[PDB]
């Protein structure tokens, strides 16, 4: 039971999914060919005799990142109907991902999702992976969200997204895609996690002292986050957390479902020896402003509810001690209407280390998912960039040329404005 289906959309989603499934195969002992020489039933379906297939679907309108999987070392893990390719890439266009190209490939992926969810008996939700700025990862992700909402309904919809960085982004039309996809994210998603590329970059530069990190480290860190999310469900612990439990304890209002996932401890091999890593200090490091994996300032916001997902040799003793010490600190301050704002989960399974990775093995690991008002200012600057581009009507003709109007841009902008007002009015004292 307790199944959860992973959906990977776009290049970012597909690569993060490749890292995630590498990590899961290492976790459960599955070789890349799909063999085991129980608890793996969460993500892997047992077929026939000793053959495990992951409960995943990989979709991209271009076939390069999927043909890498079809010819890579994990080519025998999936079967071809879990790896769906289009003809023309969305080409960083929300319009192409949502209306023109997304329409002839949505039916097949929804059929695959239906066939996958029929096999599961205890489906807990969906883990959807995408990027805001990507045309596929915005448009087709939004289309798949609305189809899943009208199809499955009450099933939990958890998604991970790569929120564009304040200074760094590889696309010129990035804010358009971000606003366009978030206008439907606000209602078709139950809990959306954002991970910023600049934050992973400088976390790798400082904590892991990697001078030249690529997207491989990005996806490995994101895979560690998702593994810590699902560890309370793929193993056993003194304190278990389920996905619906996670939503209930983390989402205070229907429109406030955008928590910040931070992970600790991230250290190289050489710095692990000199540190006697206790639960208290990694818990403190989770609240440290430079360890947040979104480039924002928690000091300038208020924490609303944070979920603490411990794994390894962790006991409730020092967890409670660390939480009390965090409470006694005035730099980290919570909202007045949430006297208890800590959701706690302890798992006995330690985080596995993938060969070739830069993360050193640790007895204890923490993945705090804090819902805070400090993320409003990131969307504030995103709105500023959107307004700067939209005043001159730049790049709008590209979206209009294939079935979109200015009205959708205006309504998405005012929807984000209402969201900003919502964070402002929930962060205020009573």
């Amino acid at each position: 039971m307790r199944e959860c289906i992973s959906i990977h959309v776009g290049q970012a989603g597909v690569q993060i999914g490749n890292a995630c499934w590498e990590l899961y195969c290492l976790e459960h002992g599955i070789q890349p060919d799909g063999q085991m020489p129980d608890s793996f039933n969460t993500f892997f379906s047992e077929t026939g005799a000793g053959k495990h297939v992951p409960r995943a679907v990989f979709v991209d309108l271009e076939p390069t990142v999927i043909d890498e999987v079809r010819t890579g070392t994990y080519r025998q893990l999936f079967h071809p109907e879990q790896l769906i390719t289009g003809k023309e890439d969305a080409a960083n266009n929300y319009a192409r991902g949502h209306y023109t190209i997304g329409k002839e490939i949505i039916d097949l992926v929804l059929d695959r999702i239906r066939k996958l969810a029929d096999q599961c008996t205890g489906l807990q939700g969906f883990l959807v992976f995408h990027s805001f700025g990507g045309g596929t990862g915005s448009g087709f992700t939004s289309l798949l969200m609305e189809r899943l909402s009208v199809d499955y309904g009450k099933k939990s919809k958890l998604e991970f997204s790569i929120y564009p960085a304040p200074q760094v982004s590889t696309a010129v039309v990035e804010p358009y895609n971000s606003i366009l996809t978030t206008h439907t994210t606000l209602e078709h998603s139950d809990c959306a996690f954002m991970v910023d590329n600049e934050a992973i970059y400088d976390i790798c530069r400082r904590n892991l002292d990697i001078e030249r990190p690529t997207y491989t480290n990005l996806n490995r860190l994101i895979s560690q986050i998702v593994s810590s999310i699902t560890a309370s469900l793929r193993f056993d612990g003194a304190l278990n957390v389920d996905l619906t439990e996670f939503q209930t304890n983390l989402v205070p209002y229907p429109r406030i479902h955008f928590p910040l996932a931070t992970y600790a401890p991230v250290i190289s091999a050489e710095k692990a020896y000199h540190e006697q890593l206790s639960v208290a200090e990694i818990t403190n490091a989770c609240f440290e402003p430079a360890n947040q994996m979104v480039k924002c300032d928690p000091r300038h916001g208020k924490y609303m509810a944070c979920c603490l997902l411990y794994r390894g040799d962790v006991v409730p003793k020092d967890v409670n001690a660390a939480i009390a010490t965090i409470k006694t600190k005035r730099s980290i301050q919570f909202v007045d209407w949430c006297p208890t704002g800590f959701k706690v989960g302890i798992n006995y399974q330690p985080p596995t280390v993938v060969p070739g990775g830069d993360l050193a093995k640790v007895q204890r690991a923490v993945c705090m998912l804090s819902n805070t008002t400090a993320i409003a200012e990131a969307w504030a600057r995103l709105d500023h960039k959107f307004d700067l581009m939209y005043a001159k009507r730049a790049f709008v003709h590209w979206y209009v040329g294939e079935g979109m109007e200015e009205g959708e841009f205006s309504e998405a902008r005012e929807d984000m404005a209402a969201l900003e007002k919502d964070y402002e009015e929930v962060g205020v004292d009573s």
Binding site: D242, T248, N249, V251, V315, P316, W337
Partner: protein, 427 residues
Amino acid sequence: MREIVHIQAGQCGNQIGAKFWEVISDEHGIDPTGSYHGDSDLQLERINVYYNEAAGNKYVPRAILVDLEPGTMDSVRSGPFGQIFRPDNFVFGQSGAGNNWAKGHYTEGAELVDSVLDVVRKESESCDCLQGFQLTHSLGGGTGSGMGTLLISKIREEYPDRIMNTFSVVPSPKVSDTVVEPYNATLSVHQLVENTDETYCIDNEALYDICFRTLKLTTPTYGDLNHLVSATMSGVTTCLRFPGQLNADLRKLAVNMVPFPRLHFFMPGFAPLTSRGSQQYRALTVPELTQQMFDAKNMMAACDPRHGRYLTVAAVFRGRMSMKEVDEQMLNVQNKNSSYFVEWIPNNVKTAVCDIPPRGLKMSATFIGNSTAIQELFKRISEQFTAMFRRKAFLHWYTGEGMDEMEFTEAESNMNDLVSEYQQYQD
């Protein structure tokens, strides 16, 4: 013969009940396979109070194991003494309430409650002279709190003249586990006020504090806490299970500790509790048991008895003991502390003596105290709820399964009424 039906709800309730069955099968000499291997006939003289006879000289507990996810059932079964339970008593769903009192009380817990009622009906009809039920659960969760509260309501509808026992662990501000603790705590205390015959206010904070300073235990896991709660349960039921020089079953404690029907929230306690280092430096006698059980440190609630007035006190002793010694100790406690006991009730302390001590201890006692100090345990929950309720926080979840804010409002009206009752009887 005065048998007790045991029910476990939620993960915490299931684990506490599992440790309770561990310690009580150790007490009654039942091996993990369920076959009697004791030495005294007193272990089988009253075995029917908890265990049902099975063909082949095999004993099965009268326990119903209830949860909304199969994980806790699998963990209970795979553990030690997990094979003793009857498989059909494992009534489990497939989703889990997800820390939602609504999902445990109305939507998905109520779908599963019919099977639980059927199994408890089997257990109550199979036995000859039932007296009451025991339910073990939490108050901060959705499965335990909400679904066990629905279960208590159903049982009281079906068995209004049988006593109701509930060993409830309540949230505390220090060890705060979830974000929706006050909602579930208030919604559960609401119906526990009128549905339970007597409730024990256990909390994880006081148990941790015991393990720190009294037991000197460096890294106490949840097993030690469940062991303390199990020892309390066994000490409460020992008068039924074992003989003594003065017997007092649960009805005697109910009539001697509930002066008014809404005042049945108790602070449990167990004596002796020792560290391994200090075992050989302490004399083992009734006066030091009495001083330990009456210490504000030995309480199992976030409630200082010095801040309130003891209405009634129950001390269920276990061992070969003088009666003059115990009675003089009660006089000394009630006279040196005349300001800490309520004044319109003479003889605030009831005494029960069982002659069979726990395994490995030649003498033990259990402290149950009906005090006005429960008022601040309720007030902290009430003020946390209020802080979360002006701003309408997390109510969209609970309203999603079909409640209304008026239900919450009447819940805090009931809790504030209970607090006012305790305060006005404190004077």
